[PDB]
Amino acid sequence: MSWGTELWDQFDNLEKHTQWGIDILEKYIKFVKERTEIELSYAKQLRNLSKKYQPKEYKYTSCKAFISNLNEMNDYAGQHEVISENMASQIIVDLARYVQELKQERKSNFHDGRKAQQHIETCWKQLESSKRRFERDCKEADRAQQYFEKMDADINVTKADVEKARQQAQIRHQMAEDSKADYSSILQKFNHEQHEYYHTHIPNIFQKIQEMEERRIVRMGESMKTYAEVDRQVIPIIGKCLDGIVKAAESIDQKNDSQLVIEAYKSGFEPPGDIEFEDYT
Amino acid sequence: MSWGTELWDQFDNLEKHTQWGIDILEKYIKFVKERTEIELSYAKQLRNLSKKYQPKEYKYTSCKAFISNLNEMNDYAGQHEVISENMASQIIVDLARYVQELKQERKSNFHDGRKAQQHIETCWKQLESSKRRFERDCKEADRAQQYFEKMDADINVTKADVEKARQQAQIRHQMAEDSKADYSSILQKFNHEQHEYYHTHIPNIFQKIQEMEERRIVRMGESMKTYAEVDRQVIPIIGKCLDGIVKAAESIDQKNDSQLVIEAYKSGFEPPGDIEFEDYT
């Protein structure tokens, strides 16, 4: 089972199918394109968020933990964004490049197809024209023969008149014969050229088209798996961010914070004791 | 080291510090609030993307894999969104609720503080007024005494005049004595009330404030770790989505796809053979 054999007469449909093929890959490329844009956007948003709440006090573990949340988020955003501007974006580039050569490769392959038809159709025109010639030359010969037969049967015509008629019949006859050989020769060429068409040129060309399409299919799949491996790299960095966060929260210390508050305001003064009795007597 | 002892005279600063405390928690709540909004947004975007490229042909593995990419993305988006509208959103609710009681608990605790000062300051006014009385009554007695001493030394004054002066001196004297006892009694109450203030009321109240603040600190931390555990749940679902995708890509089959194309267009027709020779002779 090959398109060059089983689909020998499916030029127009294969042309349509292959275009369709390019269309969905084109559409697939848009999909990942928009997805990447959404990720890049998401990242800018997290980064901007972390900046928005950063300080425009710091001694307290409560705040330090907050600054770590922010910093950790900032790094995650940046880490995430880098993966997108570098790897995600590269896959798209290669895919766009690929689609460009596919289109050419496609235009090319069908051209060879279009050309091999143009050629075979030209040998036919030749063969048809050669056959019409043989045809008419034969109608000419038959006609001339009948005339001679007529003259030859006519008792009231001369041998001179008969002769001219015999000469005319035989010349027409020879021409028919020359025309038969030309047609016979051309029918032979056509039959060879036709066989070459169906059992060589169409097969060769349609196989290139088939191989072409199967690669197109495989490429799309490979790009899908590749892109997923890229997407699968956020897990290691997401994990790292969240771990960083947990640790920040776990370093909070309400007790030391209260100790800082004492060192921040302790005045060194002692509460007043009992008041003295002033005896004015 | 306790604020009720080391910071006995740090009312205004503790009031400021504790407000600050509520302010950063308020700010922390906004942070997670905005973050959640960004996640919910991200999810809607992925979901909308998957819908945008879904079919408005299906037999080919190339397309099936595409539909799986889309479906897998749709599910991830939904799975992700649910975690956000349910868990992420709940943490915020509890935190908002918490901040509301904190504010009350704070207003309350300082009221007890404000009230214990108002009271001690009232016992002082009393003690001061009682002391001024004793003071003036003594200036009265001294004055009366001197007059009597004068009269008593005056050779040209009568015993009647002297007597009235002795009576006046002794009555003033007794009053001074009554005033001394009232002042003495009140100075005692004040000294007790004052001691109660510095070594009971301020301590009790400031400890509640301290305990209050340390809980505020711990709560913020717990909410941070909790929120991270929620964020850490995307990894299991991200992993599942990407795995689903990889499998889709791996199920592509360019060979069967070419077989389908043959079953789609095979016409059952066979290429033409050699053309017959038409001998018109």
User: What residue ranges define each of the domains in chain A, with the CATH number in brackets?
Assistant: 2-281 (1.20.1270.60)
Q: Which residue in this structure is represented by tokens 């003064």?
A: A269
Residue with tokens 């009366």: B144
Q: Which of B1, B138, B199 sits opposite A280 (nearest CB)?
A: B138
In this structure, what DSSP letter does residue A88 have?
A: I
Rama region for B268: left / alpha / beta (φ>0; ψ in -120 to 50; rest): left
Distance CA(A187)–CA(A131), nearest Å, equals 9
Positive or negative, the Cα torsion across B112, B113, B116, B119?
negative
Q: How many CB pairs under 8 A join A and B?
A: 239
- Minimum-distance CB partner of B24 among A63, A250, A277: A63
Residues of chain A positioned with their CB less than 8 A from the CB of B30: 53
Q: Using the structure block, give the residue that is written with the tokens 């460009």.
A: A100
Which of A24, A141, A210 is closest, CB to CB, to B258?
A210
In contact, A7 and A205? CB cutoff 8 Å: no
State the nearest Cα–Cα gap between A101 and chain B, in angstroms: 19
Residue B92 token pair: 């915020």
The structure tokens listed for B257 are 């796809």
Run of H or E residues at B190 = helix B159-196
The answer to whether residues B211 and B16 touch, using CB atoms and an 8 Å cutoff, is no
Q: How far apart are CA B44 and CA B42, in angstroms?
A: 6
Q: Do A45 and B61 touch (CB under 8 A)?
A: no
- Helix, strand, or coil here: B252? coil
Q: Which residues of B touch A265 (CB under 8 A)?
A: 7, 10, 13-14, 17
- Cβ distance A184 to B277 less than 8 Å, yes or no, reads yes
Q: Which residues of B touch A275 (CB under 8 A)?
A: 127, 187, 190-191, 194
Tell which residues of chain B come right before a gap with C–N over 2.5 A. 56
Degrees (nearest 5) of the Cα angle B197, B112, B26? 130
| Partner residue facing A49 (CB), from B14, B38, B264 | B38
Q: Tokens representing B170?
A: 């002794």
Contact A73, A46 (CB under 8 A): yes
Residue A270 — φ and ψ, nearest 5°?
A: -110, 145
CA distance A154 to A149: 9
For residue A97, give every residue at least 6 positions away whose Cβ sits within 8 Å of its Cβ, in sequence order, or none. Answer: none
Q: Is A198 on the interface with B (CB under 8 A)?
A: yes
Chain A contact probe: residue of B225, B227, B256 with most A CBs at under 10 A: B225
Chain A CB contacts of B22 below 8 Å: none
Q: Which residue of chain B comes nearest to A269, CA vs CA?
A: B9
> Residues A224, A229, A230, CA angle at the centre, nearest 5°?
95
Buried b (16+ CB within 10 A) or exposed e, B87-100: bbeebbeebeebbe
Q: Read off the amino acid at residue A127.
A: L
For chain A, breaks with the C atom over 2.5 A from the next N come after: 56
Instruction: Please answer whether residues B183 and B131 qualify as being in contact, where contact means their C-beta atoms are separated by less than 8 angstroms.
Output: yes
Phi, psi at A58, each rounded to 5°: -65, -20
Give me the residues of A, 218-277, that contact B with CB < 8 A.
218, 220-222, 224-225, 228, 231-232, 234-235, 238-239, 242, 245-246, 248-250, 252, 254-255, 257-259, 261-262, 264-267, 269, 271-272, 274-275, 277
H/E stretch holding A161 reads: helix A159-196
User: Token digits for A154?
Assistant: 């006519």
A61 interfaces chain B, CB cutoff of 8 Å: yes
Task: Tell me A280's DSSP state.
Answer: -
Asked if B214 reaches chain A (Cβ–Cβ under 8 Å), the answer is yes
* A26 lies within 8 A of chain B by CB: no
Could you tell me if B191 and B127 are in contact, meaning their C-beta atoms sit under 8 angstroms apart?
Answer: no
CA of B91 vs chain A CAs: smallest distance (Å): 15
Among B126, B104, B71, residue whose Cα is nearest residue B240: B71
Residues of B in contact with A271 (CB under 8 A): 8-9, 198-199
B131 touches chain A (CB under 8 A): yes
DSSP 8-state code for residue B157: S
Q: Please, are residues A73 and A237 in contact by the beta-carbon 8 Å criterion?
A: no
Amino acid in position A216:
R
Tokens in use for B127? 């003690």
Q: At what angle do helices A254-265 and A61-83 cross, to 10 degrees?
A: 120
Give the one of B49, B224, B254 whose C-beta lies nearest to A69's C-beta.
B224
What resolution, expressed in A, was reported for this entry? 2.6
Q: What is the DSSP letter of B272?
A: -
- A206 touches B: beta carbon within 8 Å: no
**B55-64, long-range: CB < 8 A, 24+ apart:** B57/A20, B59/B260, B60/B257, B60/B260, B61/A217, B61/B251, B61/B252, B61/B253, B61/B254, B61/B256, B61/B257, B62/A21, B62/A24, B62/A217, B62/A220, B62/A221, B62/B252, B62/B257, B63/A24, B64/B248, B64/B251
For residues A53 and B24, the answer to whether their CB atoms sit within 8 Å is no
